[PDB]
Amino acid sequence: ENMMVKLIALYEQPEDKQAFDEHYFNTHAPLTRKIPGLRDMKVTRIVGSPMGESKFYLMCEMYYDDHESLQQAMRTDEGKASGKDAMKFAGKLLTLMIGEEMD
Amino acid sequence: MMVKLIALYEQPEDKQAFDEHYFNTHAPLTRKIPGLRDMKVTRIVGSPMGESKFYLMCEMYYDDHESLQQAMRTDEGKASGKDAMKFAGKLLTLMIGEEM
Numbered sequence: 001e002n003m004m005v006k007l008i009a010l011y012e013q014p015e016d017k018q019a020f021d022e023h024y025f026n027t028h029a030p031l032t033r034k035i036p037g038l039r040d041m042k043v044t045r046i047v048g049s050p051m052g053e054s055k056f057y058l059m060c061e062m063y064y065d066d067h068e069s070l071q072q073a074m075r076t077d078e079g080k081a082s083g084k085d086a087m088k089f090a091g092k093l094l095t096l097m098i099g100e101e102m103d
Numbered sequence: 104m105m106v107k108l109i110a111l112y113e114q115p116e117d118k119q120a121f122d123e124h125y126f127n128t129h130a131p132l133t134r135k136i137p138g139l140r141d142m143k144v145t146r147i148v149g150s151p152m153g154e155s156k157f158y159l160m161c162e163m164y165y166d167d168h169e170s171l172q173q174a175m176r177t178d179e180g181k182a183s184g185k186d187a188m189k190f191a192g193k194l195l196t197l198m199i200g201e202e203m
C-alpha cells in the first residue's frame with residue numbers, strides 16, 4: 001500500500017561496453033518502451049561506488065499501475081519480446097527485482 | 104540528469120529488526136544530510152519468479168556529483184554511513200548513478 005510498483009533491471013559490467021551500449025539504447029530500450037501499461041521508465045548509468053568501481057553498470061526502473069498490471073505486461077507479446085532480447089544481449093549480467101516505491 | 108546515491112540491501116536474517124532500525128533510525132538520519140534533494144525507499148517484494156536476493160533499495164538524489172561528494176563527508180553523511188555499516192554492512196552495496 002501507499003506505493004508505486006516498479007520492475008527494476010540491474011546489469012553487471014559488460015565485457016564489451018560499446019556493444020552493450022549500442023544494443024541497450026538502440027534496440028532494447030525501444031522494445032521495452034512498446035510494452036502496454038508501462039507508465040514511466042528511468043535509466044540510471046552507474047558511474048562507480050563511493051570507494052571506486054561498481055559491480056553494476058546500468059539500472060532501469062519501469063513503473064506500472066499495480067502488481068497485476070506488471071504481471072500482465074510481462075506476458076504481453078511486447079513484454080516477452082523485451083525479455084527475450086535481454087536474455088540474448090545481456091544474459092547473466094541481468095538481475096530483475098519487483099519493488100514497491102514508498103510514498 | 105540527476106545524480107543519485109543508491110543503497111541496495113540483501114536479505115536480512117531478521118526482517119523485523121532490519122525494518123525497525125531502517126525506518127525508525129536510519130532513514131531519519133539520512134534525511135538530515137545537507138544537500139539531499141529527494142529520497143525514495145523501495146521495498147523489494149520479489150523477482151518476477153519469486154524471491155529476490157534483495158530486500159530494500161534507497162535512492163538519494165543530489166543536484167550534482169560535487170554536492171554528493173560533499174554531502175557524504177558532512178557530519179550527517181558520516182553518521183548515516185556509519186549507521187548503515189553497523190546494522191547492515193554485510194548486506195549493503197553502494198552505487199553512484201546518473202539518472203537520465
Ligand SMILES: [Cl-]
Pocket residue numbers: 009032060
Ligand atoms: Cl532494462
